[PDB]
Scaffold this active site. Structure first.
Site, short mmCIF file in Angstrom:
data_model
loop_
_atom_site.label_atom_id
_atom_site.label_comp_id
_atom_site.label_asym_id
_atom_site.label_seq_id
_atom_site.Cartn_x
_atom_site.Cartn_y
_atom_site.Cartn_z
N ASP A 191 0.84 -1.19 0.00
CA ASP A 191 0.00 0.00 0.00
C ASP A 191 0.87 1.24 0.00
O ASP A 191 2.08 1.11 0.19
CB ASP A 191 -0.88 -0.03 1.26
N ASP A 211 -9.24 4.09 -1.62
CA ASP A 211 -10.14 4.61 -0.59
C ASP A 211 -11.44 5.16 -1.16
O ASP A 211 -11.62 6.36 -1.34
CB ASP A 211 -9.39 5.64 0.27
O1 NOJ Z 1 -3.02 1.43 5.94
C1 NOJ Z 1 -4.06 2.37 6.16
C2 NOJ Z 1 -4.83 2.63 4.87
N1 NOJ Z 1 -3.93 3.19 3.85
C3 NOJ Z 1 -4.51 3.47 2.53
C4 NOJ Z 1 -5.21 2.24 1.98
O2 NOJ Z 1 -5.80 2.55 0.73
C5 NOJ Z 1 -6.23 1.71 2.99
O3 NOJ Z 1 -6.86 0.56 2.43
C6 NOJ Z 1 -5.56 1.40 4.33
O4 NOJ Z 1 -6.52 0.98 5.30
#
Ligand code: NOJ
Ligand SMILES: *[C@@H]1O[C@H](CO)[C@@H](O[C@@H]2O[C@H](CO)[C@@H](O)[C@H](O)[C@H]2NC(C)=O)[C@H](O)[C@H]1NC(C)=O
Ligand code: CA
Ligand code: CA
Lengths: 88, 857
Positions: free
Chosen positions: B455, B531
């Site tokens: 990520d 997100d």
């Molecule tokens: O790691 C925290 C957060 N970072 C961004 C990611 O897109 C999300 O899925 C994740 O929960």
């Protein structure tokens, strides 16, 4: 001369099958009553006899799934997983 | 979204310079006296008539109906970037022959025809034809623009600021751009990632589509802002032909689309590098898919567990919470393959570590998940806490493997662990180091059932311009961040995947989910749309977003089930489970501030609808696995727009509320609160469709208004297809991967059907290293169902057998006979419904590895 044995009738009355269709690994009864020993019916149940302790019923889908569900390990009889007795 | 944090074209000086050029007579002209023709390429000098800058055009015909155009400076001050590691091979060439020539034109024939290329010298133009059909023109609107490298050191051409971040821009303006005309094309697709419509919109009165991997907080819908990934591939569809354009450039790119007898013009504008473009001439969309796959590779074959259901959130608290979640699935009879550990699992966001209170015994937790035949996924991001007690930081600092600033020091940005540095994933030694970090000796607490999530790999930099790395940061070979940006994330994905292959001694297939991506990312695993938000329109946009990814080779796509941000109302969560259950990557995920949404926490009516969606997905795992095998072998998308299957049906060209899985299932998920029905378009003249729940037959082409309840998932099986299912739904895919198969035979109006099935051990490379797999073809015609080998190279020792056949559209037979080598002829019992013409064949009993026939007498 030779009298024949009567066939199996599903507990819900949906079919009459010979006893070679009982635990034959194919679901023939809508209530799952022809397959208490296998994973063939989606609504059947397997009885954990748990000799010496409290007996338990598990979903048919947990018979030979490679996971130890009964404390006596009898649900896993042809999966590769060898379950230890953990009833004590 | 805060739009002031991201540049519009006007705020990116190179986009503003490029886009200010309007259609007109190109100042570029080819110097035909400099033309050189060899077996692999044609080269010719191009000159800008005002500045007198000399460029070199390298024009190539390629095997499989492609053309490559490469433009670079003849005598540059320093070399320009050329994208590495994306192309899987040096593409095989096709010879160009001069069939026509005059003082301003050269006509070139590709191999023995029918393809031709006309090079016009003044103004410089290229025309691509098939016989007399003009397919595409290059520089037809005179928008070619090649900013030559000036002596290193109007507004923003050199030093440039965005908010408070200064870009020292040592090499000044070096942008490259070129236009393409597509006569007959009105519909274009691809260039992900955008939260926008599948059919791309004209950009004339607004912003161009932006390709620049960025972390966009609370991203909004139906707009062209750059999201986390970038695939510079555009497809064009018409009733007559399919074409694709692959612009191989890793720098910030802006794409303009304009429509004009019908014609679509495309313009690409990149910050740096060379002009390197592939024209994929089809003619069918399947030919374009093969063309593109020959260049950048095919989708990595997912391990079977990864096509199951994934349960995630930010964050599961500790080992006890993980184990309660695991037990919750089994206590509520809901299948799940994997439980996910987000950034709170590590020791203060030091990756490859475990919080010693939350996860004191990670191996014990992994052994408990392994006893349930389940997996775990742990997040590993490409930012390393600046901490002298953290071994990873010390080694990377000590070996100089971090991305640097111009003064030679290690770049330090702000991310999850506070001050953090960024490993230089463009450096092959850094990728080697990263892969070795996944060894079981180096990643303590890891085991063969722990997989990985990459990520924030854009890279996300909290105090950087646009939440990313400084443009003038320095990478391997002396290249600037601006040169490589869009492949940084792909490199993180590649090295993590290689790490998972290596730790096993090259036996186990990896599973890596990546946020950032580029062309070629399909070779390393899965991606997701980042997100998203717990809202109905975000549920709806998951289809066009994953479809735009499927068209450009990224078959293993999905969106967070329930939405990442906010709390979904229970009806939305059910509908998202139903949508997600029919999408390639199936994961429930939620933000830190949300309420818990494990599916058993809802009222019984919602749990029941969710369990149903889960059961449907699990039963279809053999089908999903076979589609992925076809993606792996051919480069064909798993999830498809209806126009891919119905290229002459003009009413399908923009459909994005519906999609197909292969050629067999048409899915129209319910995507509105309070819906009591859906309008389903069932295409195909002389085609039939079966409602998979009711078995009601519907003839195409038609729009059917179908009634729905909370538990409904509108799914139709196409006549002419055979779909394999595991009807014994167990707790995880490992539990089911040796079980018997049920074949669902949907008869076409001609009484025929076909379908394939791929099977192997579910997780190793044995299918390729030892040819240990099965590829079966099931086919029905007349009154006979046959199983034969679709690939005789593949053999597999397996207990998998055919337990049942469900035939839709069949009359009642008098007798059912099964034949197979080494067995006496068998008679099967059967059940038949005359109302729906559904025939169920009881227990064939035959091995899936064997040839067999079932004759209906
Ligand atoms: O790691 C925290 C957060 N970072 C961004 C990611 O897109 C999300 O899925 C994740 O929960
Ligand atoms: C390369 O292009 C040729 C020419 O378009 C393709 O051949 C045609 O295929 C269509 C079907 O889509 C037929 O209608 C034509 O009769 C074919 N034409 C010729 C001259 O054979 C060919 O399939 C393409 N090949 C690849 C590998 O993409
Ligand atoms: Ca039976
Ligand atoms: Ca069991």
């Amino acid at each position: 001369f030779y009298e024949e044995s009567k066939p199996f009738t599903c507990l819900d009355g949906t079919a009459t099958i010979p006893f070679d269709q009982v635990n034959d690994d194919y679901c023939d009864c809508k209530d799952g009553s022809d397959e208490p020993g296998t994973a063939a019916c989606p609504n059947g149940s397997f009885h954990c006899t748990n000799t010496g302790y409290k007996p338990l019923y598990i979903l048919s889908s947990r018979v030979n799934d490679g996971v130890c569900d009964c404390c006596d390990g009898t649900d896993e009889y042809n999966s590769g997983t060898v379950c230890e007795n953990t009833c004590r | 979204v805060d739009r002031s944090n991201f540049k519009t074209c006007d705020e990116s000086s190179f986009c503003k310079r490029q886009r200010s050029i309007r259609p007109g007579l190109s100042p570029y002209r080819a110097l035909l006296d400099t033309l050189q023709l060899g077996p692999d390429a044609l080269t010719v000098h191009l000159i800008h008539e005002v500045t007198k800058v000399l460029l070199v055009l390298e024009l190539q015909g390629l095997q499989k109906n492609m053309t490559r155009i490469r433009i670079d400076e003849l005598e540059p001050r320093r070399p320009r970037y050329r994208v590495p590691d994306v192309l899987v091979a040096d593409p095989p060439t096709a010879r160009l022959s001069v069939s026509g020539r005059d003082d301003n034109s050269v006509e070139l024939t590709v191999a023995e025809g029918p393809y031709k290329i006309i090079l016009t010298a003044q103004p410089f133009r290229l025309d691509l034809l098939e016989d007399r059909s003009l397919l595409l023109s290059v520089n037809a609107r005179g928008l070619m623009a090649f900013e030559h490298q000036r002596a290193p050191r109007e507004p923003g051409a050199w030093e440039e600021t965005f908010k408070t971040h200064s870009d020292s821009k040592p090499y000044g303006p070096t942008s490259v751009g070129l236009d393409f005309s597509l006569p007959g094309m009105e519909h274009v697709y691809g260039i992900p990632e955008h939260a926008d419509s599948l059919r791309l919109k004209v950009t004339e009165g607004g912003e161009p589509y932006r390709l620049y991997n960025l972390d966009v907080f609370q991203y909004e819908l139906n707009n062209p802002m750059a999201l986390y990934g970038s695939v510079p591939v555009l497809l064009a569809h018409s009733f007559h032909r399919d074409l694709g354009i692959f612009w191989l450039n890793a720098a910030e790119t802006w794409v303009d689309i304009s429509s004009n007898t019908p014609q679509t013009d495309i313009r690409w504008m990149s910050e740096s590098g060379i002009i390197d473009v592939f024209l994929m001439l089809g003619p069918s969309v399947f030919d374009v898919f093969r063309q593109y796959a020959s260049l950048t590779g095919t989708q990595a074959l997912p391990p079977l567990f990864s096509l199951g259901y994934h349960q995630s959130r930010w964050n599961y608290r500790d080992e006890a919470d993980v184990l309660e979640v695991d037990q919750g699935f089994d206590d509520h009879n809901m299948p799940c393959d994997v439980i996910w550990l987000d950034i709170e699992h590590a020791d203060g966001k030091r990756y490859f570590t475990w919080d010693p209170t939350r996860f004191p015994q990670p191996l014990n937790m992994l052994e408990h998940l392994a006893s349930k035949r389940r997996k775990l996924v742990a997040i590993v991001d490409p930012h390393i806490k600046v901490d002298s007690g953290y071994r990873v930081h010390e080694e990377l600092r000590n070996h100089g493997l971090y991305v640097k600033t111009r003064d030679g020091s290690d770049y330090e940005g702000w991310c999850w662990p506070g001050s953090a540095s960024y490993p230089d994933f463009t450096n092959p030694r850094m990728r080697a180091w990263w892969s070795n970090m996944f060894s079981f000796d180096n990643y303590e607490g890891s085991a063969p059932n722990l997989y990985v999530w990459n990520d924030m790999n854009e890279p996300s930099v909290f105090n950087g311009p646009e939440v990313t790395m400084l443009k003038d940061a320095v990478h391997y070979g002396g290249w600037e961040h601006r040169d490589i940006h869009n492949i940084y994330g792909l490199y993180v994905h590649m090295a993590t995947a290689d790490g998972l292959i290596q730790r096993s001694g090259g036996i186990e297939r990896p599973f890596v989910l990546s946020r950032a991506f580029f062309s070629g990312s399909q070779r390393f695993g899965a991606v997701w749309t980042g997100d998203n938000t717990a809202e109905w329109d975000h549920l709806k946009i998951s289809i066009p977003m994953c479809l735009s990814l499927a068209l450009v080779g990224l078959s293993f796509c999905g969106a967070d089930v329930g939405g990442f941000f906010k709390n979904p109302e229970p009806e939305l969560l059910v509908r998202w489970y139903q949508m997600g259950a029919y999408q390639p990557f199936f994961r429930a995920h939620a933000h830190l501030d949300t309420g818990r949404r494990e599916p058993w926490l809802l009222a019984s009516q919602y749990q029941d609808a969710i369990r149903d969606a889960l059961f449907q997905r699990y039963s279809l795992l053999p089908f999903w696995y076979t589609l992925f095998y076809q993606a792996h072998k051919e480069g064909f998308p798993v999830m498809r727009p209806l126009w891919v299957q119905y290229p002459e049906d003009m009413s399908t060209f923009s459909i994005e509320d519906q999609f197909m899985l292969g050629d067999a299932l048409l899915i129209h998920p319910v995507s509105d609160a309070g819906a009591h029905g859906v309008q389903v378009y069932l295409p195909g003249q002389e085609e039939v469709w079966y409602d998979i729940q009711s078995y009601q037959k519907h003839h195409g082409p038609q729009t059917l208004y179908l009634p729905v309840t909370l538990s409904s998932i509108p799914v139709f099986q196409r006549g002419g297809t055979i779909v394999p299912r595991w009807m014994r739904v167990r707790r995880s895919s490992d539990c089911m991967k040796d079980d018997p198969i049920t074949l669902f035979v949907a008869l076409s109006p001609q009484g025929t059907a076909q379908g394939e099935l791929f099977l192997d051990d579910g997780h190793t490379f044995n299918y390729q290293t030892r040819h240990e797999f099965l590829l079966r073809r099931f086919s029905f015609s007349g009154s006979t169902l046959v199983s034969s080998s679709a690939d005789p190279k593949g053999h597999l020792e397996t207990p998998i057998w055919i337990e049942r056949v469900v035939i839709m559209g069949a009359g009642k037979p008098a007798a059912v006979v099964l034949q197979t080598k080494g067995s006496p002829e068998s008679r099967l019992s059967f059940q038949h419904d005359p109302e729906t013409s559904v025939l169920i064949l009881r227990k064939p009993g035959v091995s899936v590895a064997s040839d067999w026939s079932i004759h209906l007498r």
